[PDB]
Amino acid sequence: TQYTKLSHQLISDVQAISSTIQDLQDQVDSLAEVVLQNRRGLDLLTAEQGGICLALQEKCSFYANKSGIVRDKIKNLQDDLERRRRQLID
Amino acid sequence: TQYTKLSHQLISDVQAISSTIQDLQDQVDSLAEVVLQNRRGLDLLTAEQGGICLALQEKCSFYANKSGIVRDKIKNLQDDLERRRRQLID
Amino acid sequence: TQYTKLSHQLISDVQAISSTIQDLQDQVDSLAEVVLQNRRGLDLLTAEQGGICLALQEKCSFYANKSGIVRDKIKNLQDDLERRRRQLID
Ligand SMILES: [Cl-]
Ligand SMILES: [Cl-]
Ligand SMILES: [Cl-]
Ligand SMILES: [Cl-]
């Protein structure tokens, strides 16, 4: 009874954590669309300067997206929790 | 002894993870304020064009905030860990 | 056999979660560089107005970075998982 209970608690905690990580990736993705449109906007406004990075005389920063990596890992983890719940009944 | 130890370890890990998720939401919220002010700034600069999205001739991106969802879930999880610690003593 | 198995599962879950949190911090850091360059860009374009916040007649938003806090916590957690794996063999 004790081992399955702690097993159940682990699955529940990991599920809750996984949904929260999804929420964070959801926000990062949403915010990133706004930020990259803002960069396109600044590049438009400074087109004659060659874009905002050249206007600033700076090394240019670009976004390194990992949305697919995170979403796959979370889905694969959630799929494993589904299997684990089943085996606790069985 | 073993079961409470693994129980203790689960609670400690989940607590540490939960604080790190809070940190991520803290940064997302902070960065989002900067990004949305940047959008207001671009919309001001291109007011005569109808704002930055129309100036870019693009579908307009807006931010989808989930801060309250995440913060509630984390607080509710931390509250449960508090109860679990108590029951391990009891 | 059961206790080490659930112990193993906890370590594996926490490891997977920790890597995903790293991914999120990686994206936040990358996106933050783009956002802060965008702010410098807007401040350049509105230099005569005193920068974008004064041009907007708004309280100015600045980014509160916690990258080092998160990365340390994750590395320290991963180091502990390494020790725990070893003790499960021993
Ligand atoms: Cl489990
Ligand atoms: Cl931005
Ligand atoms: Cl527990
Ligand atoms: Cl463990």
Curated annotation (Swiss-Prot), chains A, B, C:
Glycosylation sites: N65
Subcellular location: Virion membrane; Host cell membrane
Annotated membrane topology: Single-pass type I membrane protein
Extent of motif CX6CC: 53-61
Cysteines joined through disulfide linkages: C53-C60
Stretch list, region Immunosuppression: 36-52
Ranges in coiled-coil conformation: 1-47, 57-90
Protein name, per record: Transmembrane protein
Species annotation: Mason-Pfizer monkey virus
Residues shown, of full length: 423 to 512 of 586
